[PDB]
Amino acid sequence: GPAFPGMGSEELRLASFYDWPLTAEVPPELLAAAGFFHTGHQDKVRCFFCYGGLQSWKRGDDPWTEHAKWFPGCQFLLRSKGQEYINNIH
Numbered sequence: 001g002p003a004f005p006g007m008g009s010e011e012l013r014l015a016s017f018y019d020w021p022l023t024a025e026v027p028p029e030l031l032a033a034a035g036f037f038h039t040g041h042q043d044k045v046r047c048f049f050c051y052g053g054l055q056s057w058k059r060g061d062d063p064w065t066e067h068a069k070w071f072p073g074c075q076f077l078l079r080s081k082g083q084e085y086i087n088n089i090h
């Protein structure tokens with residue numbers, strides 16, 4: 001199961017980005033869709049399922065790409081995007 005079942009809802013994850021500092025650079029909509037919620041500190045986010053944390057986001061970063069790059073074993077990622085997607089990023 002998920003590390004943090006309470007953030008399994010995409011809408012709850014999106015709400016967590018109310019004070020996100022990088023709206024134009026890395027959209028909250030895409031971060032939330034990709035399993036991430038905002039910790040509230042700087043640009044630190046975490047996936048609700050694998051609990052993997054990512055920070056130091058660069059403008060134009062693709063949240064799903066970064067998810068697969070750093071946490072390829074995440075089952076939410078696999079369920080959502082499929083194995084071919086994960087394999088191609090590697």
Ligand SMILES: CN[C@@H](C)C(=O)N[C@H](C(=O)N1CC[C@H]2CC[C@H](NC(=O)C(c3ccccc3)c3ccccc3)[C@H]21)C(C)(C)C
Pocket residue numbers: 039044045046052053054055056057058061066070
């Ligand atoms: C350029 N795109 C971004 C999304 C990126 O690749 N970020 C990397 C990243 O954040 N990573 C890579 C994979 C993870 C391991 C190293 C880094 N982890 C953290 O920064 C976490 C952390 C560890 C120790 C002290 C403070 C923070 C972290 C924890 C919770 C939330 C966010 C990050 C995570 C970085 C900083 C190494 C370029």
Ligand SMILES: [Zn+2]
Pocket residue numbers: 035047048049050051052067071074075076077
């Ligand atoms: Zn994950």
